[PDB]
Enzyme design. Structure first.
Site, PDB file in Angstrom:
ATOM      1  N   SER A  44      19.221  42.348  30.034  1.00  0.00           N
ATOM      2  CA  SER A  44      19.955  43.267  28.787  1.00  0.00           C
ATOM      3  C   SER A  44      18.302  44.263  27.746  1.00  0.00           C
ATOM      4  O   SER A  44      18.485  45.516  27.060  1.00  0.00           O
ATOM      5  CB  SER A  44      20.702  42.617  27.963  1.00  0.00           C
ATOM      6  OG  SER A  44      22.332  42.713  27.916  1.00  0.00           O
ATOM      7  N   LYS A  47      19.458  47.453  27.471  1.00  0.00           N
ATOM      8  CA  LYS A  47      20.035  48.863  26.840  1.00  0.00           C
ATOM      9  C   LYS A  47      18.945  49.632  26.314  1.00  0.00           C
ATOM     10  O   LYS A  47      19.525  50.692  25.341  1.00  0.00           O
ATOM     11  CB  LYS A  47      20.403  47.656  26.218  1.00  0.00           C
ATOM     12  CG  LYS A  47      21.834  47.396  27.020  1.00  0.00           C
ATOM     13  CD  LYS A  47      22.024  46.137  25.873  1.00  0.00           C
ATOM     14  CE  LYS A  47      23.891  44.919  26.801  1.00  0.00           C
ATOM     15  NZ  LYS A  47      23.106  44.593  27.838  1.00  0.00           N
ATOM     16  N   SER A 104      23.861  43.227  22.006  1.00  0.00           N
ATOM     17  CA  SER A 104      24.052  43.103  22.867  1.00  0.00           C
ATOM     18  C   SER A 104      25.539  42.851  23.571  1.00  0.00           C
ATOM     19  O   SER A 104      25.769  42.531  25.397  1.00  0.00           O
ATOM     20  CB  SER A 104      23.365  41.959  24.066  1.00  0.00           C
ATOM     21  OG  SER A 104      22.078  42.009  25.264  1.00  0.00           O
ATOM     22  N   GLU A 140      27.132  46.216  34.323  1.00  0.00           N
ATOM     23  CA  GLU A 140      27.107  44.550  33.657  1.00  0.00           C
ATOM     24  C   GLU A 140      28.497  44.400  34.163  1.00  0.00           C
ATOM     25  O   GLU A 140      29.051  45.130  34.286  1.00  0.00           O
ATOM     26  CB  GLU A 140      26.999  45.295  32.538  1.00  0.00           C
ATOM     27  CG  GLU A 140      25.544  45.229  30.900  1.00  0.00           C
ATOM     28  CD  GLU A 140      24.721  44.557  31.585  1.00  0.00           C
ATOM     29  OE1 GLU A 140      23.864  44.189  30.890  1.00  0.00           O
ATOM     30  OE2 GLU A 140      24.598  43.176  31.863  1.00  0.00           O
ATOM     31  N   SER A 211      19.111  38.071  28.763  1.00  0.00           N
ATOM     32  CA  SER A 211      18.893  36.547  29.751  1.00  0.00           C
ATOM     33  C   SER A 211      19.613  37.184  30.518  1.00  0.00           C
ATOM     34  O   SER A 211      20.756  37.556  30.563  1.00  0.00           O
ATOM     35  CB  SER A 211      19.481  36.177  28.146  1.00  0.00           C
ATOM     36  OG  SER A 211      18.972  35.554  27.304  1.00  0.00           O
TER      37      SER A 211
HETATM   38  O1  1CE Z   1      22.596  35.207  25.025  1.00  0.00           O
HETATM   39  C1  1CE Z   1      23.121  35.883  26.336  1.00  0.00           C
HETATM   40  C2  1CE Z   1      22.609  35.279  27.059  1.00  0.00           C
HETATM   41  C3  1CE Z   1      22.545  33.632  27.921  1.00  0.00           C
HETATM   42  C4  1CE Z   1      23.076  33.118  28.945  1.00  0.00           C
HETATM   43  S1  1CE Z   1      23.369  34.594  30.314  1.00  0.00           S
HETATM   44  C5  1CE Z   1      22.937  35.874  29.024  1.00  0.00           C
HETATM   45  N1  1CE Z   1      24.087  37.208  28.981  1.00  0.00           N
HETATM   46  C6  1CE Z   1      24.035  37.864  27.174  1.00  0.00           C
HETATM   47  N2  1CE Z   1      23.819  37.065  26.108  1.00  0.00           N
HETATM   48  C7  1CE Z   1      23.243  37.945  25.520  1.00  0.00           C
HETATM   49  C8  1CE Z   1      22.299  38.738  25.331  1.00  0.00           C
HETATM   50  N3  1CE Z   1      21.637  38.748  23.907  1.00  0.00           N
HETATM   51  N4  1CE Z   1      20.410  39.000  23.914  1.00  0.00           N
HETATM   52  N5  1CE Z   1      20.064  39.323  25.822  1.00  0.00           N
HETATM   53  N6  1CE Z   1      21.406  39.064  25.714  1.00  0.00           N
HETATM   54  C9  1CE Z   1      23.002  32.079  29.825  1.00  0.00           C
HETATM   55  C10 1CE Z   1      21.261  31.057  28.739  1.00  0.00           C
HETATM   56  C11 1CE Z   1      20.988  31.640  28.024  1.00  0.00           C
HETATM   57  C12 1CE Z   1      22.294  32.773  26.726  1.00  0.00           C
END
Ligand code: 1CE
Ligand code: 1CE
Ligand code: 1CE
Length: 262
Positions: A44, A47, A104, A140, A211
């Site tokens: 992310s 973004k 996000s 995404e 993440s």
């Molecule tokens: O937190 C997640 C996660 C997580 C994943 S995938 C994912 N996708 C988006 N997001 C929201 C995000 N916030 N900032 N970047 N992405 C695996 C375990 C930990 C949390």
């Protein structure tokens, strides 16, 4: 090899993963790099580039950020905290930018990508502002597969730090657009466990986290420390196994090493 680089190497060794760091200190334009030219999945953190590309388009279209975009049930993907409230309705491009950056929201990101014509429109904006390294290849949620050795949807710490500097402190965007991007980053909701957790509490931070698979855990930040010129810091982290756990603490630890080395 500097003392800071040796500490980052020790942190990386204990973490089991692969860590990438790039700092720009705008007080003197000096840099600290750790694996600064290796590629990492952006997740992310991409973004920021998409929101900035839309801000650039808005420089010649005063009403672009107010344009409504339809949200349909089929548009929802894997993480849509804001867009799900607007299904069968609309969100403006400003609302989509704010939701993507501060929450996000992945549906919001897909609408930004579509406004730019597809992933390659984000890459094209990167090239236009002097970033030869960034590449966005997918929408995404598949841009988060984060497979080791896969070049898709990656950048390097050095390139992302330079780009984040140009977008937030330099002149890649017009003045009002740069201020809007900074306001959005400073209002992020997702960052308190990442770079921010390793820095003195009195400092002000705007950031975007990421993440993904392979325990990929990222943060890119602009930092206004107490009593000195701003810093740009990017911390990328990825791990050998697809189902590895998130490790925001590693990013906090990297930021703390950077701060102690100032
Ligand atoms: O937190 C997640 C996660 C997580 C994943 S995938 C994912 N996708 C988006 N997001 C929201 C995000 N916030 N900032 N970047 N992405 C695996 C375990 C930990 C949390
Ligand atoms: O052998 C280890 C190990 C081992 C660990 S941690 C570690 N750290 C450094 N080293 C020293 C080293 N020399 N060349 N590469 N690494 C777990 C069990 C196996 C051995
Ligand atoms: O999307 C996530 C997430 C999310 C998490 S964890 C996670 N892990 C893998 N993935 C990717 C995936 N695995 N199988 N299909 N897609 C929490 C916030 C919502 C999204």
């Amino acid at each position: 090899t500097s003392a800071v680089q040796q500490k980052l190497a020790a942190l990386e060794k204990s973490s089991g993963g692969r860590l990438g760091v790039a700092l720009i200190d705008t007080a003197d334009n000096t840099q600290v790099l750790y694996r600064g030219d290796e590629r990492f999945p952006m997740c992310s953190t991409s973004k920021v580039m998409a929101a900035a590309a839309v801000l650039k388009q808005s420089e010649t279209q005063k009403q672009l950020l107010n344009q409504p975009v339809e949200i349909k049930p089929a548009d929802l993907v894997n993480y849509n905290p804001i867009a799900e409230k607007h299904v069968n309705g609309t969100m403006t491009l400003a609302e989509l930018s704010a939701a993507a950056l501060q929450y996000s929201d992945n549906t919001a990101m897909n609408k930004l990508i579509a406004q730019l014509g597809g992933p390659g429109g984000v890459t094209a904006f990167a090239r236009a502002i002097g970033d030869e390294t960034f590449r966005l290849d997918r929408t995404e949620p598949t841009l988060n597969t984060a497979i080791p050795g896969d070049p898709r949807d990656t950048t390097t710490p050095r390139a992302m730090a330079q780009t984040l500097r140009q977008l937030t402190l330099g002149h890649a965007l017009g003045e009002t657009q740069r201020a809007q991007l900074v306001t959005w980053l400073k209002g992020n909701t997702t960052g308190a466990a990442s770079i921010r957790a390793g820095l003195p509490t009195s400092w002000t931070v705007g950031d975007k986290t990421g993440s993904g698979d392979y325990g990929t855990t990222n943060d890119i930040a602009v930092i206004w420390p107490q009593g000195r010129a701003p810093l740009v810091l990017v911390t990328y982290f990825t791990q050998p196994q697809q189902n590895a756990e998130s490790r925001r603490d590693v990013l906090a630890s990297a930021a703390r090493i950077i701060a102690e080395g100032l």
